[PDB]
Design an enzyme around this catalytic site. Structure first.
Site, PDB file in Angstrom:
ATOM      1  N   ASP A  45     -89.094  91.512  26.418  1.00 42.88           N
ATOM      2  CA  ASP A  45     -88.053  92.622  27.053  1.00 42.88           C
ATOM      3  C   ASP A  45     -87.959  93.792  26.162  1.00 42.88           C
ATOM      4  OD1 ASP A  45     -86.679  93.734  28.966  1.00 42.88           O
ATOM      5  OD2 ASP A  45     -84.839  92.761  28.085  1.00 42.88           O
ATOM      6  N   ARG A  91     -76.887  92.696  32.196  1.00 44.39           N
ATOM      7  CA  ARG A  91     -77.178  91.363  33.002  1.00 44.39           C
ATOM      8  C   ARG A  91     -76.449  90.271  32.390  1.00 44.39           C
ATOM      9  NH1 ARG A  91     -82.852  89.239  35.320  1.00 44.39           N
ATOM     10  NH2 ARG A  91     -82.111  87.546  36.711  1.00 44.39           N
ATOM     11  N   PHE A  92     -76.821  89.995  31.159  1.00 41.36           N
ATOM     12  CA  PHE A  92     -76.151  88.789  30.612  1.00 41.36           C
ATOM     13  C   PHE A  92     -75.298  89.498  29.036  1.00 41.36           C
ATOM     14  CE2 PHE A  92     -80.627  87.945  31.590  1.00 41.36           C
ATOM     15  CZ  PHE A  92     -80.725  86.972  32.644  1.00 41.36           C
ATOM     16  N   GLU A 100     -71.327  91.146  27.828  1.00 42.25           N
ATOM     17  CA  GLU A 100     -70.723  92.282  27.955  1.00 42.25           C
ATOM     18  C   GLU A 100     -70.652  92.629  26.304  1.00 42.25           C
ATOM     19  OE1 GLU A 100     -66.715  92.638  29.229  1.00 42.25           O
ATOM     20  OE2 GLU A 100     -66.760  94.899  29.262  1.00 42.25           O
ATOM     21  N   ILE A 140     -68.108  98.510  24.995  1.00 39.00           N
ATOM     22  CA  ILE A 140     -69.269  99.626  24.924  1.00 39.00           C
ATOM     23  C   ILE A 140     -70.319  99.373  25.747  1.00 39.00           C
ATOM     24  CG2 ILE A 140     -68.781 100.342  22.479  1.00 39.00           C
ATOM     25  CD1 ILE A 140     -70.643  98.622  21.413  1.00 39.00           C
ATOM     26  N   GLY A 141     -70.530  98.398  26.536  1.00 37.24           N
ATOM     27  CA  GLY A 141     -71.633  98.150  27.548  1.00 37.24           C
ATOM     28  C   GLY A 141     -71.712  97.069  28.372  1.00 37.24           C
ATOM     29  N   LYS A 142     -72.197  96.913  29.318  1.00 42.17           N
ATOM     30  CA  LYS A 142     -72.386  95.873  30.313  1.00 42.17           C
ATOM     31  C   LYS A 142     -73.525  95.692  31.056  1.00 42.17           C
ATOM     32  CE  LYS A 142     -69.139  96.912  33.543  1.00 42.17           C
ATOM     33  NZ  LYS A 142     -68.233  96.821  34.829  1.00 42.17           N
TER      34      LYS A 142
END
Ligand code: 3WN
Length: 303
Positions: free
Chosen positions: A135, A17-18, A20, A13-15
């Site tokens: 963040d 920076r740290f 997947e 569902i998502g990639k």
């Protein structure tokens, strides 16, 4: 281990920076699995560490299930298994939908409640350290089925040791999403030995998230298109220098439309944004105060 061997990955569902993120199935339930490679062990271990903080669990913080490892016979994957939220991020949710005044309050109040819980120290045998996110952004907040939020992506967090006034990883460098960095982070004036400074920088980023939500509040069919904060002043993927010139030098903040003064809910939301956006971190509202203000508004509205 025993958990990863019983999980079936269904969709990437998502990639980030740290790691997947994948949607998986565990004991017939949907779960989210964040996978890191062998060379990302430091990032995986730190995130597992923050998510295992004593007394962290709260309805407005992503529910962590377990850290694990899975060997497919060629390579090892490092897993972090959590609750799955179908709506995904608040960023996705605000791009796809508009919200009612009630919907807006529910999203803002739940974000503030989650942040107030991260920031709160609980003293005792099963004590909880104060935690700063570092963040916070709409892409790091998830929306639950009930229309409330939970803060996620705690891998960059820092934890306070209250008796000595020390931070667990002694941060000596700027981290996080450039667009959401507080003025003191952008111009590097922040005292990275001062934990209260990290809480204050989170409040500034929460202010920008509230502005994102309020634009999508639809009253009498009136609302704004989705935009990231500073969309009107910086490029996509802005640099520290680009952000600093706007936030610190020209001293601009996202525009607050005057029509947010004609609606009580939007007026309260606008006042909170302005009080999160002061250049002086010490003047900013606390997450607890924001929670108290929005709790009062929610009661008045009958949510
Ligand atoms: N920090 C962390 C660790 C593990 C998974 C996640 N992400 C998620 N968790 C739960 N539901 C989700 N739904 C959609 C996208 C997601 O990314 C997602 C974040």
């Amino acid at each position: 281990g025993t958990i990863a061997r019983t999980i079936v990955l269904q969709e990437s569902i998502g990639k980030g920076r740290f790691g997947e993120v994948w949607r998986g199935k565990w004991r017939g339930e949907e779960v989210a699995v964040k996978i890191f490679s062998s060379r990302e062990e430091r990032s995986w271990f730190r995130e597992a560490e923050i998510y295992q903080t004593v007394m962290l669990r709260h309805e407005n913080i992503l529910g962590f299930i377990a850290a694990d490892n899975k060997d497919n016979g060629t390579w090892t994957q490092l897993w972090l298994v959590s609750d799955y939220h179908e709506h995904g991020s608040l960023f996705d949710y605000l791009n796809r939908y508009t919200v009612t005044v009630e919907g807006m309050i529910k999203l803002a109040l739940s974000t503030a409640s989650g942040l107030a819980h991260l920031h709160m120290e609980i003293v005792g045998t099963q004590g909880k350290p104060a935690i700063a996110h570092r963040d916070l952004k709409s892409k790091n907040i998830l929306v639950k089925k009930n229309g409330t939020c939970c803060i996620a992506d705690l891998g960059l967090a820092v934890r306070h040791d209250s008796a000595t006034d020390t931070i667990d990883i002694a941060p000596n460098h700027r981290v996080g999403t450039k667009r959401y960095m507080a003025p003191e982070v952008l111009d590097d004036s922040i005292n990275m030995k001062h934990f209260e400074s990290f809480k204050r920088a989170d409040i500034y980023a929460m202010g920008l998230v509230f502005w994102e939500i309020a634009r999508r509040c639809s009253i009498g069919g009136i609302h704004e298109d989705y935009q990231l904060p500073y969309y009107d002043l910086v490029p996509s993927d802005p640099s520290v220098e680009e952000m600093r010139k706007v936030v610190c030098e020209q001293k601009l903040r996202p525009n607050i439309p005057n029509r947010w003064q004609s609606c009580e809910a939007l007026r309260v939301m606008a006042k909170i944004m302005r009080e999160c956006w002061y250049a002086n971190g010490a003047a900013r509202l606390t997450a607890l105060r924001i929670k108290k203000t929005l709790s009062q508004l929610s009661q008045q509205e009958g949510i």
